[model samples]
Target: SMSYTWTGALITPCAAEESKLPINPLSNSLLRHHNMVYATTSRSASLRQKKVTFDRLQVLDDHYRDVLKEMKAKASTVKAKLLSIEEACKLTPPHSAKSKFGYGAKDVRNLSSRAVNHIRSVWEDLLEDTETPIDTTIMAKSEVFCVQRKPARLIVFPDLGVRVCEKMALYDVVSTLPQAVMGSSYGFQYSPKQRVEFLVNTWKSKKCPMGFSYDTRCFDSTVTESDIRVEESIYQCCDLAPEARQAIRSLTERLYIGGPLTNSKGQNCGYRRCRASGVLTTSCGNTLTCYLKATAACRAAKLQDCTMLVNGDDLVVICESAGTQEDAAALRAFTEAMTRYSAPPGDPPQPEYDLELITSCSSNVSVAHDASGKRVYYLTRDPTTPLARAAWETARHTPINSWLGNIIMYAPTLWARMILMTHFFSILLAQEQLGKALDCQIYGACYSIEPLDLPQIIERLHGLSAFTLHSYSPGEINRVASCLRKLGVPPLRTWRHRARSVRAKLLSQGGRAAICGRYLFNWAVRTKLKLTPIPAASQLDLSGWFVAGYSGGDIYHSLSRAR
Candidate 1:
């Protein structure tokens, strides 16, 4: 549930000289050096909207009111319940996206008293407008394996009853208050097997750890207005309800300190001054102000045995190496205390002496090959957006389910159990829609899913030895042979001969196609299938999508069916 670095294509079943089309799609020498490094890191939204609205600066004291009084005493022992406009109209998904108040999500999951009275008048105009501010809907996402048409990414979005009143006012305080205030440096609370067991126990607790990775650039428009009033003074030190603190200060001055931007011809494209990438406190306000400006720039870079890991604004920093000219003057005073706290560094932080060439959340920690061939230490990427969305789901058709969330979180890679589970289970078995219930999306929401439950969703998000692995890591076989020759696709020996005829047509179409080719093509079959636990993995709640085994003052409470 991470892999989104930049952002697939694959129509070659009968290869015909790689079927023509290229002379000038930038002279396809693998998309001309990945389209000249995405036209050399393309950026500019009127110069990041004039440095996030006329160059910002944030200062607040007492370590920002002691991390907003410990996230308002952990959002006051969080009890978030409200769901029910028919349990938030049956948690929306039967392929969502449709209510300009007309209807869809199957008429709001069949409650349809005119879609539950237009979602109870958009949750009573979000509790009778604390003062207007909710205008959202921006766009431009694109990216089907980018070979240079870069511009795209803006995305704002709001309304499905304002994301069900933001899953009832801040989904369990932004899914368990940043692990109750940045524990294990809370990057959406770990897992890719606890982030490769916290990078192999921080590279065996250092003899030479020294890692690095930091990038911020427009981190939701350098967030200002005193970083949305220090996240509404930690949601008004939570004893809420004075109409939930004027709907959280009128959703923080009409949508988190900035608002109003319209495109797609409705014209008035103006007035968004900063920080508004659709809300629910945009990833807990960038993991609480990028871990309070990287724990105050690691105490002003006196960084010895440091060891940090932040996620929003992505940073990594394993410590204990300051020799080469004081490791370049403690990385130039940690990028001048992260550009005097406006969170800078979109480049220039790198200092890893090795730690497997450090990378974060667009995962790293490589080496593969396992069907008795051995090697192993999993987690890999670069099948260029799952072979360009499996060649745009074999030409036209996409809810961008992203191949069952990349075969349920990279089911032991080698391109997700052999080329995204054999090209989206042979295009959902040639559109018979392998036992229906389509829809996908994960972190952002939506659910339904089913393509014959890829053997119980890759045995509960990567287990059952991810269909018997099978060797990798010469740095993940040179980035899976340079992402199968820059997305031209079809290679691992023709995806192990089209996964032995898609594992003999999923065991001749028996029930759940013989448990999806005996647990998703158990390494193109030798003999295996004893793996158990199915009945839909205990009807899933996955507490708002997996964030470590609790503790940071836990207590969430929402789940009445959240697949």
Candidate 2:
């Protein structure tokens, strides 16, 4: 089946779009090569469409069925609930696209009569009309980059009423089933620290560990109709309500299997038979599908004792080595197996002897020394993209601040602590918005986090050692230094000097601001303040922070189940 068939309609935007980073004093202070920072816009949609549209060929073998059987057995232990209309309504993000039936996200969240009535109709229609292809809006995503002019990623989603109905049917399945089926292999279940620990332990557990990260080229496009239906079969293994079962089957046939693409202006753009990137099952589906394929690929490659870490389409595997020559040949065989499974690699996988050299989820495990001089393992990445996006976010006020997300996810890193925290805290202090809650994403879920709460959030997420960590590995330091130089970002020494001023201002403001200054910026001072566990860190409800990935799944922090 074709991934997409176009009707010659352009994928248009709703309003004006900015494709270049704006030059400003704040952004200039951080990055000088502003021209290098660019954003993907609808102008590049055709190129992206060409890249993603393709026919997929999948050859399932005995190994694939073996893994599927294992997954189904694990899934059978799960009993998923159907979300009530009210419950699903409260889970909707406030800025979600309005329904074609005259109701918006706010109305849905408030459970207004109009929104409720429309939602009921949509659900009933789903149950009644299973064969009709659902309508989906196709839009090109605008994401920031540094000198890498990749085309905009396409997003395909249905109307608000259908989206709400999706949540009511599959929200519980997505949240609960992935972890239960995949267990520790599910990457979103671990925090940054836990991830590092798992990687280290898995590495050490192997006899001469050899690892590699696999990159599936355009994973969503490679998803075939058979793949989606296989995913549906796995979901059907769970104990579900009768209505839930009917809704799931109807959605599988109507919405999940294939859909007609409608542009923003209501023009027919195309039809997509591949996996919709914005569907509720995207994260879980990708995780399960990728894992099934990779697990079979491992068997085909004859890799031994392979332990995989999977987060949606991102995959990293650590396993026992069979000498350098054999490992290299084995990886080639692995690539061939994956290609046969229809998920080909973008970049060929190379076996790595060192854990730090294998990058997954755009991050690698690195070591830093704590105050006690004991080596502490942490996660770090090449700061080029993070810095580039931070510069863009600094210049333009965006809905979600990638800088804050970088700060939270990479709190223990040198670049994040010195550059990101200093730069952003200064801007927040100047705007006097340190107490105002700003939205950021952690593990693909949107969270409304305030800058002043950094002390507690950091402590809870990364531990107090995040504030006292020093003596970063040379590889980590070199990567950060090279990124700064490449982007014309100011050196660490300059940020340290600037941080002193920001730290003092925050301290004078008192309360949470003072706490942020003392804990987050303590590294800027010659004599750091004595670090201790934040009193409030223990009380923070961070249960769902590392639970799962929800990218493009219309999830918010408020939807997290209370501890």
Candidate 3:
């Protein structure tokens, strides 16, 4: 029997040959997290069917092999920690992981105060380190490590084996720096229903699924979105599905992977949508809202840049983040080990090693400085001409592009992304430079993502030590659910809760199809209005009603909103 596994976390399989998160919360279902990025080339709804999925794994890392045995050998202590903390990252013996172990005598209640004292000692060291904060909590092990330099050097190991040194991008290294956004505690106790559901609704409120809406009815139209803002109604009818919303939203704005609101227009000043007539998106992070406005612009650009693609033109989606999700301790240790004691038996000669080779084991963690010695750099892309990108001088030595197209530049779990990371890391650096050189006008690749996640990437790298591959068993449905736990540093699971109420409403099609009437409509309406993306009780909230009512032939081209 063959089974699939991700880079980190754990999943206790339940009965049957399928993977499910209890479609109805009360049912017994589970979700195992894996640090790798999950993807599908096909665009469709029904998590139950019709999707091609893929994830990445480093099946041959000897160091990881040792860690896997160590972890399995100590599942007892590990399981104890898992139960105690609502969430956690990789396990470090004398550090935070060990400290969290609860005390027990006759199974008598709360963990001992002594354990807390041990935790305090561990935290002291963690806090004293100026590189990371003491208050930082490590949850979800998806992380990567990257190296930084005062002079800035970008070393690339291309998809096909090409090496070059260049400057870095803000998004490329943010996952490793001091500012990395740590994980959420909910992951530890989460059930599939709560986790996936939360993610769906949150992104829905985020106005994902692309293409904005226009209040063709003008400002005073009584048929506007807010007119139907009944909390109960919204929750039941238009609320977004946590998992569904995320999958689609991630793809729409080019935020396609990891990680919303509205404006003043009575016309759904806050609603989500599925389709659009004209659209355009600009490269600007003045705010995440910029993604919406820019998306509208991108739609418009589509009408001009290439109309054949307007409806059926294959759109290649990408997800990029210039931020981190966890602390750098695990990654730093590994880097130091590699750069220092990297005498891995008789694999290769030591003389061939250099700073570039040192970081190659984990290509994502990096650092930089601005001469002040006061401010350090991590997860930041210098958006300027290579020479003018003041953040780093290494950029000038390499050629980079500053175009803001949605591309998933860095997801290490998947084998394919690693291929692209070779060029993409360099490309983003160039784009970051363009933005900086051009006076911070949001520069190239106007992404809607927060600064790249340097901290998170590092966590993922450490978590990789936790991954284990299985031969194969059952179908893909089971594979996805089971593999979630081992994927990598845990990702912040789910989004806001109330968004689903919004999606539930908009998705109601009376008697229409699910995707057309429910999911897509929710995506279209909320996104189009440029409002805080929220789901409607039913897709009929007007705009979706308007578009779907007339989706026929070439006439749609001639069908102007003026009618």
Candidate 4:
């Protein structure tokens, strides 16, 4: 059937004027051609309409509780079980763990939930906002969906023999051969995923984007006077200015780089005591942070903001955001300002800064005390710097920050920390219901620190200045108390129950993480501390072990952090 199209998008007739039988294939083809040709003629455009990733991440709230159904476990049962385990992990202090460096990792003294909410943070299912008497939104804003939505953007081409673009716009940019010849003839097919997979395969197979370059360029030379070996320049695959670069990294872009710190209960050695605590929190802190900054700047200059969310504790950097050409175009415009023109070294190309109404992605962590201790994360920024001041100014318009922290949780590392923090917060929200959600995005990448209120805190270029808030319904609430009670009376099977709960399937990357908090902690300890086969303990020495510093934290402190 023939259809109408314009600007590369299909245009269907109005419902009333539409009919079924007179479908003309030739007309349909013409329609398709015109649609594509109109948008593609001799030019390139950013396909930012990539489903507006996560624009639809929402849950149905149950505030009005149509049926008035509330699920919960008795507090006494949860309290008793928690107490028993807490007592068990409160062992002898390790004085040997003290730090030679002043910013020494303080052995978290009170292994309690309150402490967990300090250095790092825990995620919460609900904000426990009693301020509002009634709410209609169904979903509470506190849970994370393990699944991500898929978004796509269409890139069309229309220039064949003729160029199609504004003439005076830039004679250097466009050309005119024959309008008829260019109407709908030439273009290259490029599915980012397809291209990436193809290149990746070639790399694994022969080792090049267009296949191995072992042509005449790699032929052996017979003359001893000349040395030859594939005279290839990096620019072959790294074109600075092409018709359209898959990656248009903004000049003023921000990316998150880091990974969550695992819950290494044993390695912590009571904070101030651990021998290496000084290096970990003090000396190492200064050196590593600067090192990261220099590396980031160098990398950004070449990659045009090859950024990702970071997991601070483990220092994990996720590069998925820049994995595709379309995704790069979707990034904030200013992220590639420096790449626009070659003005001068220090004089960067001025880029546009946007006060986004809402970020495409975000994260939030709640602080709550648990028996295994606590994990609390604090984020502070200095408003003196231009970048920081701009971020604070922009953040005021966003509601997601006030209700939920404005964290862009796209990176796996960032998500890992977010998950850990949520587990810690779950304890406090054990018996309450919540509803609210937040949203935000990082230009490319950025890093976060615990106890952030410092002079040098927000002065760097690779920092988030645009902080804001946007919220919907709060998230749903889930409690682990029921399972704890079902295990048996704590007084009777105290030891047995401890072992049982520990093995009761600690979080394995789901909402269930709260029910079994140790899953993340166990992973954290195993990887970060390098304790060399540390024995499994019933209760995670969360606050003390997981968190090596202050700003009050819990498992998520051990949980880690990111944008």
Question: Where does candidate 2 clash, by residue pair?
Answer: none
Question: RMSD per prediction, one decimal?
Answer: 22.2, 1.7, 30.2, 31.5
TM-score order of candidates, best first? 2, 1, 4, 3
Q: What is the C-alpha lDDT of each candidate?
A: 0.61, 0.91, 0.19, 0.19
Q: Could you tell which candidate, 2 or 4, scores higher by lDDT?
A: 2
Lowest lDDT 10-mer window, candidate 3?
158-167
Highest-lDDT candidate: 2
Question: What's the CA RMSD of model 1 in angstroms?
Answer: 22.2
The numbered model that scores best in TM-score is 2
TM-score of 3: 0.15
Q: Which digits, one per residue and each the tens of the lDDT, describe model 2 over residues 360-383?
A: 999999989988999999999999
My TM-score estimates for the predictions, one after another, are 0.35, 0.98, 0.15, 0.17
State residue 492's C-alpha deviation in candidate 1, in Å. 21
Tens-place lDDT digits, model 4, residues 147-219: 1111122211111100001011111111111111111110101111222222233233421111100011100
